[PDB]
Design a binder for this molecule. Structure first.
Ligand SMILES: NC(=O)c1ccc[n+]([C@@H]2O[C@H](COP(=O)([O-])OP(=O)(O)OC[C@H]3O[C@@H](n4cnc5c(N)ncnc54)[C@H](OP(=O)(O)O)[C@@H]3O)[C@@H](O)[C@H]2O)c1
Ligand SMILES: NC(=O)c1ccc[n+]([C@@H]2O[C@H](COP(=O)([O-])OP(=O)(O)OC[C@H]3O[C@@H](n4cnc5c(N)ncnc54)[C@H](OP(=O)(O)O)[C@@H]3O)[C@@H](O)[C@H]2O)c1
Ligand SMILES: CCc1nc(N)nc(N)c1C#C[C@H](C)c1cc(-c2ccncc2)cc2c1OCO2
Ligand SMILES: CCc1nc(N)nc(N)c1C#C[C@H](C)c1cc(-c2ccncc2)cc2c1OCO2
Lengths: 157, 157
C-alpha cells in the first residue's frame, strides 16, 4: 500500500491556528480536491471534525476517545497503527491529510509528498515536521493568486 | 520561459473525435482545473472554440484565419512562433493544452508533461503524438471512477 501526504505550508512553517487554516489562497484548494478525488484520506480527529466529510472521498479517522460517525464514507480507528493495518487490506493508496499530530507521526512512513508553499506569514500554533533527507522534489509549479502559492511534489529515493 | 503540456489520452491514443473528447471520466477535469489555475494556456483555434474561455485561465490561441475575441483574457496569434515570442514577454510559464495539431507541433519543445491515461478505447480521429525518448515519468497516481484514469507527470532529461 502506497502512502502519500498532502499539506499546504505557509512561508514561516505554520499550517494551522487553533482548528483553522489561517489563510485563503484562491485556487490552491483545487489541488487538494483534484489529488484527493475518490481517494482514502487518513486524518486525525481534530482536522476531521473541523473539515467534515467532503463528498467523493473516503476517510480513515484516528481517535483515542470514542468519537463516532454515521457517514458511510468514514471509518474510525483507535490508533494510527490499526488504521494502517486495516487500510492495506481494503485499498492500495492512502493520502495522509493532517493535522499536525498526524503529519508528525507519519512523515517518515510516506512515499510521496504534495506540498503547497503559501506566500504568507500568518499567526498560528501548528507546524509541519521537518522533511526527511531522503525526499527530493521532482515537480514544481508556481501560481499567482490573491496569496501566491507554489506546488511541489517530492518522492522518497 | 517554461513550457508544460497537459492532456488526457485514452488507451488507444485517441484524444478527440471531431470537436469532442469522446469520454467523460468523472473527477479527471479537476486535475486540469487545478494545474491550469491562473495560467497561460496555448491552444489551437478548434480546441478553443470547443471549450470556450472558461474563467481564471488566460488563453493564447493560434489561427491562420481572422478569428478574433473581445475577451481580455484571450490573445490571438497568426502563428506558434509568434505566440511563443509574445508570451515570453509577459509570463515565465505556458501550458500547451491542445488540440492534436498543437500537441504535435510543440511536444519537442516542452519541459513537462501532465498525462492522464483514460481507461477506455473510443472511436476518434484525433491522436496524441508519440512522446520523445528523453521524457521520463516522475509521479503516478491512479483514480477509480465511472471510467478509471491514471495521472502521470513526465520530466525532460
Ligand atoms: N495546512 C494544511 O494543509 C492542513 C491540513 C490539515 C490540517 N491542518 C491543521 O492542523 C490543525 C489540527 O491539527 P492537530 O495536530 O491539532 O490535530 P489532528 O492531527 O488533526 O488530530 C489529533 C487527534 O487525532 C487523534 N490521534 C492522534 N494520534 C493518534 C494515535 N496515534 N492513535 C489514535 N488517535 C490519534 C487524537 O484524537 P482524540 O482527541 O479523539 O483522541 C488526537 O487528539 C488545524 O489547525 C488544521 O487546520 C492544516
Ligand atoms: N483529450 C484531451 O486532453 C484533449 C485536449 C484538448 C483538445 N482535445 C481535442 O482535440 C480536438 C481538436 O484538435 P485538432 O488537432 O483538430 O485542432 P486544434 O489543434 O485544437 O486546432 C487546430 C487549429 O489551430 C490552428 N493552427 C494549428 N497550427 C497553426 C499554426 N502553426 N499557425 C496558426 N494556426 C495554427 C488552425 O486554426 P484555423 O483553422 O482557425 O486557422 C487549426 O485549424 C478536439 O476534439 C478536442 O476536443 C482533446
Ligand atoms: C485546501 C487545504 C489544503 N490544501 C493543501 N494543499 N493540502 C491540504 N492538506 C489541505 C487541507 C486540509 C484539511 C483537510 C482541511 C480541509 C478543509 C476543506 C474544507 C472544504 N473544502 C476544502 C477543504 C478545511 C479544513 C481543513 O482543515 C481545517 O479546515
Ligand atoms: C478536462 C479535459 C482535459 N483533461 C486533461 N487532463 N488535460 C486536458 N488538456 C484537458 C482538456 C481540454 C480542452 C481544453 C477542453 C476543456 C474543456 C473544459 C470544459 C469545461 N471545464 C474544463 C475544461 C472542454 C473541452 C475541451 O476540449 C473539448 O471540450
Amino acid at each position: 500500500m502506497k502512502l502519500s501526504l498532502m499539506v499546504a505550508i505557509s512561508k514561516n512553517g505554520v499550517i494551522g491556528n487553533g482548528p483553522d487554516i489561517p489563510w485563503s489562497a484562491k485556487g490552491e484548494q483545487l489541488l487538494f480536491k483534484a489529488i484527493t478525488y475518490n481517494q482514502w484520506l487518513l486524518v486525525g480527529r481534530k482536522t476531521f471534525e473541523s473539515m467534515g466529510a467532503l463528498p467523493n472521498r473516503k476517510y480513515a479517522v484516528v481517535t483515542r476517545s470514542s468519537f463516532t460517525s454515521d457517514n458511510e464514507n468514514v471509518l474510525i480507528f483507535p490508533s494510527i497503527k490499526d488504521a494502517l493495518t486495516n487500510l492495506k487490506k481494503i485499498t492500495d493508496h492512502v493520502i495522509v491529510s493532517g493535522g499536525g499530530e498526524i503529519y508528525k507521526s507519519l512523515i517518515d512512513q510516506v512515499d510521496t509528498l504534495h506540498i503547497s508553499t503559501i506566500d504568507i506569514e500568518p499567526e498560528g500554533d501548528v507546524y509541519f515536521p521537518e522533511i526527511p533527507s531522503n525526499f527530493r522534489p521532482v515537480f514544481t509549479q508556481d501560481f499567482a493568486s490573491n496569496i501566491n502559492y507554489s506546488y511541489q511534489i517530492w518522492q522518497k529515493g
